[PDB]
Design an enzyme around this catalytic site. Sequence first.
Site, short mmCIF file in Angstrom:
data_model
loop_
_atom_site.label_atom_id
_atom_site.label_comp_id
_atom_site.label_asym_id
_atom_site.label_seq_id
_atom_site.Cartn_x
_atom_site.Cartn_y
_atom_site.Cartn_z
N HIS A 62 -20.25 35.11 63.18
CA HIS A 62 -19.53 36.15 62.42
C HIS A 62 -18.70 35.53 61.28
O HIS A 62 -18.65 36.08 60.18
CB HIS A 62 -18.60 36.97 63.33
CG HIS A 62 -19.29 37.53 64.54
ND1 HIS A 62 -20.33 38.42 64.44
CD2 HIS A 62 -19.07 37.35 65.86
CE1 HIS A 62 -20.73 38.78 65.64
NE2 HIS A 62 -19.99 38.13 66.52
N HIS A 92 -9.55 31.89 60.27
CA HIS A 92 -10.90 32.07 59.79
C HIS A 92 -10.80 32.82 58.48
O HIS A 92 -9.71 33.26 58.09
CB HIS A 92 -11.74 32.86 60.77
CG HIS A 92 -11.19 34.21 61.00
ND1 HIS A 92 -10.24 34.46 61.97
CD2 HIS A 92 -11.36 35.37 60.33
CE1 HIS A 92 -9.87 35.72 61.91
NE2 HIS A 92 -10.50 36.28 60.88
N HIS A 94 -12.94 35.78 55.69
CA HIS A 94 -13.95 36.77 55.38
C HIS A 94 -14.25 36.58 53.90
O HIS A 94 -13.35 36.33 53.11
CB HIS A 94 -13.48 38.18 55.63
CG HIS A 94 -12.97 38.39 57.01
ND1 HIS A 94 -13.75 38.88 58.03
CD2 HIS A 94 -11.77 38.11 57.58
CE1 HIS A 94 -13.04 38.94 59.15
NE2 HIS A 94 -11.84 38.45 58.92
N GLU A 104 -10.90 41.87 52.98
CA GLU A 104 -10.86 43.04 53.87
C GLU A 104 -9.79 44.00 53.38
O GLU A 104 -10.07 45.14 53.05
CB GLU A 104 -10.63 42.58 55.30
CG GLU A 104 -11.76 41.71 55.81
CD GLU A 104 -11.94 41.75 57.30
OE1 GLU A 104 -11.00 41.42 58.03
OE2 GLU A 104 -13.08 42.10 57.72
N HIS A 117 -7.34 34.72 57.42
CA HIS A 117 -6.56 35.26 58.54
C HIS A 117 -6.09 34.16 59.46
O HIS A 117 -6.93 33.50 60.07
CB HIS A 117 -7.41 36.26 59.33
CG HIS A 117 -7.70 37.50 58.56
ND1 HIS A 117 -8.73 38.36 58.87
CD2 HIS A 117 -7.08 38.01 57.47
CE1 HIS A 117 -8.73 39.36 58.00
NE2 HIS A 117 -7.73 39.18 57.15
N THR A 196 -10.00 43.36 62.92
CA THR A 196 -10.95 43.87 61.93
C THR A 196 -12.40 43.68 62.35
O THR A 196 -13.30 44.03 61.58
CB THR A 196 -10.73 43.24 60.56
OG1 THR A 196 -11.01 41.84 60.66
CG2 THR A 196 -9.34 43.52 60.01
O1 LIG Z 1 -12.40 38.54 62.25
C1 LIG Z 1 -11.35 38.92 62.73
N1 LIG Z 1 -10.25 39.07 61.97
C2 LIG Z 1 -9.21 39.55 62.66
S1 LIG Z 1 -7.70 39.88 62.08
S2 LIG Z 1 -9.54 39.92 64.32
C3 LIG Z 1 -11.20 39.24 64.20
C4 LIG Z 1 -11.34 37.93 64.97
C5 LIG Z 1 -11.08 38.16 66.43
C6 LIG Z 1 -9.91 37.69 66.96
C7 LIG Z 1 -9.63 37.89 68.29
C8 LIG Z 1 -10.49 38.56 69.13
C9 LIG Z 1 -11.67 39.02 68.62
C10 LIG Z 1 -11.94 38.82 67.28
ZN LIG Z 2 -10.27 38.21 60.19
#
Ligand SMILES: O=C1NC(=S)S[C@@H]1Cc1ccccc1
Ligand SMILES: [Zn+2]
Length: 258
Positions: A62, A92, A94, A104, A117, A196
């Site tokens: 992802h 991470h 996006h 986002e 993030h 998100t």
């Molecule tokens: O991509 C993301 N951005 C966020 S803010 S939550 C999600 C990552 C995530 C973090 C924790 C649990 C599941 C997913």
């Molecule tokens: Zn994120």
Amino acid sequence: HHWGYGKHNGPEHWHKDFPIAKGERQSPVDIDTHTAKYDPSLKPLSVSYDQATSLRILNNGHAFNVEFDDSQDKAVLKGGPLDGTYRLIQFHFHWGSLDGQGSEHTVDKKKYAAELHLVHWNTKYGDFGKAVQQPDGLAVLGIFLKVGSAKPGLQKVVDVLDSIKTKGKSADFTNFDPRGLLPESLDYWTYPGSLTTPPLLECVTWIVLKEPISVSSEQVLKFRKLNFNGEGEPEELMVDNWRPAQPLKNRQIKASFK
Ligand SMILES: O=C1NC(=S)S[C@@H]1Cc1ccccc1
Ligand SMILES: [Zn+2]
């Protein structure tokens, strides 16, 4: 679950397996700068990353996550809208297929090239899994990326991506200093929202910095060479791994700055 960012499994489909996708406090949102209110009640924001211990970088199909040791208060976020102490667990990004999309959150409907993030959890709940079940469980520091000059503090990330090209791959990633990803100013907007991605849990206090960081075209191009797929599967470039803005509903966005 088989969610993703394609036509067949993207954001518009998530609600079928995760009905909270249509909830009352979903993220991201558009930040209307002319509606957001300066809040003099907000305390100063404190980013305390001096003792941060990065461990590993993982392509999870992802995004890629840089993971931290969160077994103690080594890297924490406090202050601002937050009560108590929030421990950094991972960061991470996006990003888009082109420089005109990827973030986002949006600012007056402007999309940035990417969004960072930094995910933190409230230590009064003891572990991350418990924290995501609480309305004040997480604090996510969001930072926009625009394409311009290179970000020196990002290059160590960029240079390891070749080694985690496909889903499920990880690499040792020690001694990375997340302070090098911050802008100069910590001016921010804040509002209550969600994760998100699935499971889309409504557990986040969002802190979105006003000042973007600049990264070079070459840096963001290397993000776009990552793969959503696993090794030995047909190539699907990891691009446009962003959820669009969701309805604000009953919420107010507060500004830390006049
Ligand atoms: O991509 C993301 N951005 C966020 S803010 S939550 C999600 C990552 C995530 C973090 C924790 C649990 C599941 C997913
Ligand atoms: Zn994120």
